[PDB]
Design a protein around this ligand. Structure first.
Ligand SMILES: *[C@@H]1O[C@H](CO)[C@@H](O[C@@H]2O[C@H](CO)[C@@H](O)[C@H](O)[C@H]2NC(C)=O)[C@H](O)[C@H]1NC(C)=O
Ligand SMILES: *[C@@H]1O[C@H](CO)[C@@H](O[C@@H]2O[C@H](CO)[C@@H](O)[C@H](O)[C@H]2NC(C)=O)[C@H](O)[C@H]1NC(C)=O
Ligand SMILES: *[C@@H]1O[C@H](CO)[C@@H](O[C@@H]2O[C@H](CO)[C@@H](O)[C@H](O)[C@H]2NC(C)=O)[C@H](O)[C@H]1NC(C)=O
Ligand SMILES: *[C@@H]1O[C@H](CO)[C@@H](O[C@@H]2O[C@H](CO)[C@@H](O)[C@H](O)[C@H]2NC(C)=O)[C@H](O)[C@H]1NC(C)=O
Ligand SMILES: *[C@@H]1O[C@H](CO)[C@@H](O[C@@H]2O[C@H](CO)[C@@H](O)[C@H](O)[C@H]2NC(C)=O)[C@H](O)[C@H]1NC(C)=O
Ligand SMILES: *[C@@H]1O[C@H](CO)[C@@H](O)[C@H](O)[C@H]1NC(C)=O
Ligand SMILES: *[C@@H]1O[C@H](CO)[C@@H](O)[C@H](O)[C@H]1NC(C)=O
Ligand SMILES: *[C@@H]1O[C@H](CO)[C@@H](O)[C@H](O)[C@H]1NC(C)=O
Ligand SMILES: *[C@@H]1O[C@H](CO)[C@@H](O)[C@H](O)[C@H]1NC(C)=O
Ligand SMILES: *[C@@H]1O[C@H](CO)[C@@H](O)[C@H](O)[C@H]1NC(C)=O
Ligand SMILES: *[C@@H]1O[C@H](CO)[C@@H](O)[C@H](O)[C@H]1NC(C)=O
Ligand SMILES: *[C@@H]1O[C@H](CO)[C@@H](O)[C@H](O)[C@H]1NC(C)=O
Ligand SMILES: *[C@@H]1O[C@H](CO)[C@@H](O)[C@H](O)[C@H]1NC(C)=O
Ligand SMILES: *[C@@H]1O[C@H](CO)[C@@H](O)[C@H](O)[C@H]1NC(C)=O
Ligand SMILES: *[C@@H]1O[C@H](CO)[C@@H](O)[C@H](O)[C@H]1NC(C)=O
Ligand SMILES: *[C@@H]1O[C@H](CO)[C@@H](O)[C@H](O)[C@H]1NC(C)=O
Ligand SMILES: *[C@@H]1O[C@H](CO)[C@@H](O)[C@H](O)[C@H]1NC(C)=O
Lengths: 950, 316, 36, 49
């Protein structure tokens, strides 16, 4: 029997108080929703790498545990009984039931425990809670607190429970998984995310949040794992003659040292390593433990006798009587130096030993005597090991295995290791070439140690993993995209962007929502699920083109649209000394050794802060004087009360108040702007008041009053519509305008995303500052991120090293921050320049630039302030209704060709009229409407009519 | 007829810092963690650029509300547009676009595809071109209102200070001069590869940056070896960690250098895309009065053509 | 002429330009001619 | 220069002349039209004091 562990098996990773924070940690925890063995019955169970134990109790049946490796008194074993908590570690004799270097003496109940054994310490966490459930473990979450930590030094592999015989229990196992733990206001862990449970949890951990917004995220990577190990060495059975050197009858003099070559053999280096006959065994090349896993192209044994005090000279980087005149090793020497005392072997005195990179300079003798340590003779053997890339002949005692092709394996070729797929190559290696290399200096191909064949090494399949999801506010369902892989290799939908799994493929196209790539988008639709489709580019609409037909609008509407632009960003400033060396003189003195980096950081940030005020002024301060509207507002039916300042309020307009409601100790500070919101509102107020009462003149020079209706007539002529249209339809135009403004309010008050462009700036800068602070917790190789903890524990010689590691990491973090701020500032500056251009061309005048001041024919614009930016309301003229008219390029009268001075000729089926292009208003064709140029024998498409002569 | 070529986008690259620095190596991965969030910052910076690239593309090409098409009977008063309109037999690109497309060409490094494929870009340029030819400037401002092509030109002539009777009296000449000018464009583009150097330069610069980033993996940065596996198979953990830290610092520094340059280059591309988008609205959807903005001489009309990573404008 | 160039190491490479510094005979240098 | 079969088929002596110097600087055996900054002129000492 088994049950669902749900979210049990989480414990406090340490003993530090935290609150209101998401903390990421990796430790041995019970994986979420794993299966645990259900017992009802005292069997011996594996302990593995740690055990999660839980039980339900009613009558104190479950009373203890036994932990050990054999559990039979023949080994060290831990006994815990709870009858009063009693703990003993005697080698106890135990179907045991309950009817030393350490000793301690002091369903309705759920008892949970975590048992893990690390570096000799048996760590016990526990939690007891009330329950009301017989059938199974209750579902829920609670973190377990540390209770006991036993310094026993006892190996635990198996364990057994102890029951009282006159209660079910569960056993799971811990794994090295990553969890994101949520601490509430009182410092209690109230929730947690298991980062390996599923793709949504993986996304939550990646984003450091328990909430995920709508969109596509790159969170992890798909990586194929090796299935077996492949070990290959030459099939040689010869053993290397090391004994012939180390147990040699006689050694040569140091002035005339011997050099023996070792090749074509198996070298067991554990003999020389383990031998207790040596005075020293010092390796400069490789670490001894690993030495036996390698294979060399050759080993040379340099054999000689020197005086004891000279033994220290047999090394790289040395000078001295031997190092300079008798025997020298190169500074990059690779290998091991082995030496031992010969006082009971060579000493007699013995005058056969004389003294004068790898040079044999073929002079005095030493008299070695048994009664002379520094004056005693020593036998020295230097083993020079060549690890150059070449066919190897001297291999350690490692057994080979069979080689497996076209599989993902963990390989070892003569000491060269890696992970990848081995295939047959077509590479023609030269006789002396054992390995090939790629551009990244990785291994491209290898010649097999036993068989003369060349294999290619291709890294095992991998690719990026993206999670596609609607926000967790609506659904916890996700789809997963595997980037650049085949669906046959990893609802399954193959796209050019990767293999998409979990999204239904449908034929219907729609407007793109969450983009995937290569024309494919995803969305959440009906019951609901994630779907994928090829995006639509818009509706299709043909044009009824012919050589004699023109469509002319008969009616129009007034449209008001909103354009939102960033102008400025937060004026931050950072104190590099306080950031790196907050209140610490000892490191401050070392920071000075880096020169002017702090000066440069301060100047860069200051320059940006100043620029922010410049950007603000360029956009808003374009008015010479502060203008105000009259106490009597009569603009011909046009209602501006929702864009003009409200006297009862910072005297902002109604719409500006809406805009302002949608956008929201470490040496880090924030400086205020020069111009406060009140001052910005005065500038927009003046610009608006100026525009309404004086039109375009306040920009060009003096503000010259004009009736509003006449201002509009001017603006209409500017778009090709005769001014009589405005006056005849003045009531309609004013009503369409007033309605359009009301629509703006309904949208802005309900759609927060309307001002996303300004909110994005705020969010990006907030992230940069939070990231900069979080970096202070990094060690960067130091023993601790905290300078005070280093200084209170380490002395000045050592300490300075730990401090330099922190200075470099923290200084690098500041430079990264500043660079990004300068790049972002450039983007803001460009936006501010555009906004300033629009102020002059859209608000102070009238634009003739297509789609510059909104879609349609521009009439006028009104500025509104917003947090860190400006909002423009653009008023445009848009044709609404149209009719099909027959046309002609010219008319024949007396043979003369008549062309319109303005407008086009139109036919209603019986008569020809002339009318303005942007509004149907047919006039009688007369000599005062047309001009004559050329004749009927020249103009193509000319038609016959009668032109009236007044 | 003159040709103006502008970059719109750059390759959407992405780099896996863990695979780049510690490809398949747990021992150094555990040390990389000691540097905090540097990988998070590198990933966000590159992602932001990749997203921007699709934004730039859309701002330039998706300026049409509907997909417009020309009529089955093409009669534009003697003006031959068959070399700029889509060829039904082909990705249905125009003849000239096909010429443009023929001139521009394991380490944790990958490349992401664009949201809009070449086929989708061609549909947008097709709609913009079809719209301009049959409805002039109106499809931009609002509804597409059909107008005879010769009359559209008369409007465009009045806009440069030349009375419309000039167009009609010389309509045959004007159409012939136009048709010849287009043929000249083809002769140049098909033979002069350097004609699209502005787009090729973007491709070359980004290719160099990626190749340089990979080559840096071979550097030792003071270590005994650039290869982590060779360090791990040879040295014990106390010594090894030192050799590894030297490689981590050098490789992490190389990634930061790469990302910084990509952000700076992206800013240049963004500015170019903004200019291209401005020209689309002011040169193609309307008629410009801005000197030398839409080519030398008095602007009449413009036609967009797609190109690899950019847009090409033919200014009349 | 162009004589006096040798493989700098024993690693297989292909389709690549590899930069190396070693003791090589300089191109187009003069060499003593013996017949002695 | 290593060919497809891993044989050195060509080589540039970076100290032979200014064109070879340019080829080495650019890591290519082909040099495009233009002006390149490839090295530095430096006067050497003639005696020790
Ligand atoms: C703790 O004791 C267990 C035995 O209970 C050790 O595991 C054995 O190791 C040997 C040698 O590799 C194997 O042949 C046995 O099969 C293993 N037995 C079991 C049950 O796994 C374990 O290695 C000891 N722990 C330590 C650190 O020495
Ligand atoms: C301009 O429009 C506003 C709408 O916001 C009008 O204000 C409304 O007037 C009616 C009648 O007195 C009140 O019942 C509403 O409560 C008012 N609305 C608000 C938000 O206060 C205003 O009267 C109009 N002014 C002109 C001259 O037309
Ligand atoms: C032009 O369109 C406008 C609407 O945009 C028409 O005005 C509306 O007419 C209806 C009656 O059919 C009224 O109920 C609405 O209240 C009017 N709207 C406004 C804002 O006044 C206008 O009549 C149309 N003109 C022509 C000639 O068709
Ligand atoms: C538009 O111009 C093209 C030139 O590209 C004309 O196509 C040529 O027509 C002639 C006569 O049939 C053929 O011999 C050529 O081979 C065609 N050229 C190509 C590239 O196909 C086309 O006929 C012209 N159309 C109009 C209406 O003038
Ligand atoms: C204006 O210039 C055009 C050329 O750009 C002249 O048209 C050419 O006239 C010659 C005869 O002299 C013909 O051989 C060419 O084929 C014509 N070219 C075209 C495109 O048709 C035009 O005649 C000149 N007009 C005036 C009044 O001088
Ligand atoms: C538990 O066992 C100890 C053994 O020393 C005994 O002294 C104690 O009274 C017992 N307590 C209970 C509740 O049985
Ligand atoms: C913290 O404890 C107090 C009781 O002192 C309680 O009122 C409050 O709700 C607790 N806060 C949380 C987040 O549990
Ligand atoms: C040298 O001889 C001793 C026995 O006195 C032996 O233990 C040792 O392994 C020999 N050394 C070698 C390299 O064989
Ligand atoms: C491996 O063994 C085969 C015999 O099966 C032998 O022919 C071959 O030479 C051996 N390889 C090496 C490198 O010794
Ligand atoms: C998110 O959920 C809340 C319910 O708490 C709902 O009121 C809100 O409208 C939802 N947000 C969106 C964008 O649907
Ligand atoms: C997947 O493999 C099949 C061959 O079985 C091939 O036809 C298809 O194009 C491949 N798709 C991708 C994305 O590689
Ligand atoms: C689209 O419709 C075709 C039939 O015309 C069918 O074969 C195809 O599977 C459909 N695709 C999807 C995603 O429904
Ligand atoms: C003009 O005529 C065409 C063809 O009958 C028709 O599709 C189009 O809707 C008509 N347009 C107007 C404004 O009547
Ligand atoms: C054209 O307009 C005139 C003047 O209003 C009118 O008498 C005539 O009937 C109209 N023709 C048609 C076909 O509607
Ligand atoms: C308009 O097109 C029709 C149909 O092709 C043709 O008969 C007529 O002559 C053309 N008129 C003009 C002025 O081109
Ligand atoms: C216009 O009238 C004249 C007669 O004065 C005639 O010759 C010519 O063909 C007519 N044009 C059209 C288009 O009907
Ligand atoms: C490589 O060798 C093959 C013969 O196996 C030959 O055909 C080919 O041309 C050679 N390639 C080069 C670059 O020399």
């Amino acid at each position: 029997a088994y049950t669902n562990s749900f979210t049990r098996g989480v414990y406090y990773p340490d003993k530090v108080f935290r609150s209101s924070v998401l903390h990421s940690t990796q430790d041995l925890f019970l994986p979420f929703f794993s299966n645990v063995t259900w017992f009802h019955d005292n069997p011996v169970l594996p302990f593995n790498d740690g055990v999660y134990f839980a039980s339900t109790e009613k009558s104190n049946i479950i009373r203890g545990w036994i932990f050990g490796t054999t559990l039979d008194s023949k080994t060290q074993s831990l006994l815990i009984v709870n009858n009063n908590v009693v703990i003993k570690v005697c080698e106890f004799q135990f179907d045991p039931f309950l009817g030393c270097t350490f000793e301690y003496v002091s369903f309705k109940n759920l008892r949970e425990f975590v048992f893990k054994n690390i570096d000799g310490y048996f760590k016990i966490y526990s939690k007891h809670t009330p329950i009301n459930l017989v059938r199974d473990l209750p579902q829920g979450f609670s973190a377990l607190e540390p209770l006991v930590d036993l310094p026993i030094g006892i190996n635990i592999t198996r364990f057994q429970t102890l029951l009282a015989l006159h209660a079910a229990y569960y056993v799971g196992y811990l794994q090295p998984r990553t969890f994101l733990l949520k601490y509430n206001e009182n410092g209690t862990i109230t929730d947690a995310v298991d980062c390996a449970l599923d793709p949504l949890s993986e996304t939550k951990c990646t984003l450091k949040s328990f909430t995920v917004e709508k969109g596509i995220y790159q969170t992890s990577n798909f990586r194929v794992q090796p299935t077996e190990s492949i070990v290959r060495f030459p099939n040689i059975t010869n053993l290397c003659p090391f004994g012939e050197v180390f147990n040699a009858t006689r050694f040569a003099s140091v002035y005339a040292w011997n050099r023996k070559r070792i090749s074509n053999c198996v070298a067991d280096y554990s003999v020389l390593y383990n031998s207790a006959s040596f005075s020293t065994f010092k390796c400069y090349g490789v670490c001894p433990t690993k030495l036996n896993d390698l294979c060399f192209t050759n080993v040379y044994a340099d054999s000689f006798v020197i005086r004891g005090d000279e033994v220290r000279q047999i090394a790289p980087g040395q000078t001295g009587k031997i190092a300079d005149y008798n025997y020298k090793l190169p500074d990059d020497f690779t290998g091991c130096v082995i030496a031992w005392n010969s006082n009971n072997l060579d000493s007699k005195g013995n005058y056969n030993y004389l003294y004068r990179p790898f040079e044999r300079d073929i002079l005095q003798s030493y008299g070695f005597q048994p009664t002379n340590v520094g004056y005693q003779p020593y036998r020295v053997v230097v083993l020079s090991f060549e690890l150059l890339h070449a066919p190897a002949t001297v291999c350690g005692p490692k057994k080979s295995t069979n080689l497996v092709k076209n599989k993902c394996v963990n390989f070892n070729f003569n000491g060269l290791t890696g992970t990848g797929v081995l295939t047959e190559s077509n590479k023609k290696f030269l006789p002396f070439q054992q390995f090939g290399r790629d551009i990244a200096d990785t291994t491209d191909a290898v010649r097999d140690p036993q068989t003369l064949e060349i294999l290619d090494i291709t890294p095992c399949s991998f690719g990026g993993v993206s999670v596609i999801t609607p926000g967790t506010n609506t659904s916890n369902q996700v789809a997963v995209l595997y980037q650049d892989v085949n669906c046959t290799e990893v609802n399954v939908f193959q796209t050019r962007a990767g293999c998409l799994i979990g999204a239904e493929h449908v034929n219907n196209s729609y407007e793109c929502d969450i983009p995937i790539g290569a024309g494919i988008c995803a969305s959440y639709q009906t019951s609901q699920s994630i779907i994928a489709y090829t995006m639509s580019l818009g509706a299709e609409n043909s044009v009824a083109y012919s050589n004699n037909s023109i469509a002319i609008p008969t009616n129009f509407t007034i449209s008001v649209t909103t354009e939102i632009l960033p102008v400025s960003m937060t004026k931050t400033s950072v104190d590099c000394t306080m950031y790196i060396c907050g209140d610490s003189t000892e490191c401050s003195n070392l920071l000075l050794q880096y020169g002017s980096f702090c000066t440069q950081l301060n100047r860069a940030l200051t320059g940006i802060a100043v620029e922010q005020d410049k950007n603000t002024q360029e956009v808003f301060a374009q008015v010479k004087q502060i203008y105000k509207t009259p106490p009597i507002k009569d603009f011909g039916g046009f209602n501006f009360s929702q864009i003009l300042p409200d006297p009862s309020k910072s005297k902002r307009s109604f719409i500006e108040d809406l805009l302002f409601n949608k956008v929201t100790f470490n040496g880090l500070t924030v400086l205020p702007p020069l111009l406060t919101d009140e001052m910005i509102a005065q500038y927009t107020s003046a610009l608006l008041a100026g525009t309404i009462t004086s039109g375009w003149t306040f920009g060009a020079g003096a503000a010259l009053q004009i009736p509003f209706a006449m201002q509009m007539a001017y603006r209409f002529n500017g778009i090709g519509v005769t001014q009589n249209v405005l006056y005849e339809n003045q009531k309609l135009i004013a009503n369409q305008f007033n309605s359009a403004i009301g629509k703006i309010q309904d949208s802005l008050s309900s759609t927060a995303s309307a001002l996303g462009k300004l909110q994005d700036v705020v969010n990006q800068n907030a992230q940069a500052l939070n990231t900069l602070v979080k970096q202070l917790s990094s060690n960067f190789g130091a023993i601790s991120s905290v300078l005070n903890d280093i200084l209170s524990r380490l002395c000045p010689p050592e300490a300075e090293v730990q401090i330099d590691r922190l200075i470099t990491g923290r200084l690098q973090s500041l430079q990264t921050y500043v660079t990004q701020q300068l790049i972002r500032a450039a983007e803001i500056r460009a936006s501010a320049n555009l906004a300033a251009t629009k102020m002059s061309e859209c608000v102070l005048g009238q634009s003739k630039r297509v789609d510059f001041c909104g879609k349609g024919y521009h009439l006028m614009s009104f500025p509104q302030s917003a947090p860190h930016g400006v909002v423009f309301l653009h008023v445009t003229y848009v044709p609404a209704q149209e009719k099909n008219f027959t046309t002609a390029p010219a008319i024949c009268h007396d043979g003369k060709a008549h062309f319109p001075r303005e407008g086009v000729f139109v036919s209603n089926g019986t008569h020809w009229f002339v009318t303005q292009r942007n509004f149907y208003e047919p006039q009688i064709i007369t000599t005062d409407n047309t001009f004559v140029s050329g004749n009927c024998d020249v103009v193509i498409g000319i038609v016959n009519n009668t032109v009236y002569d007044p």
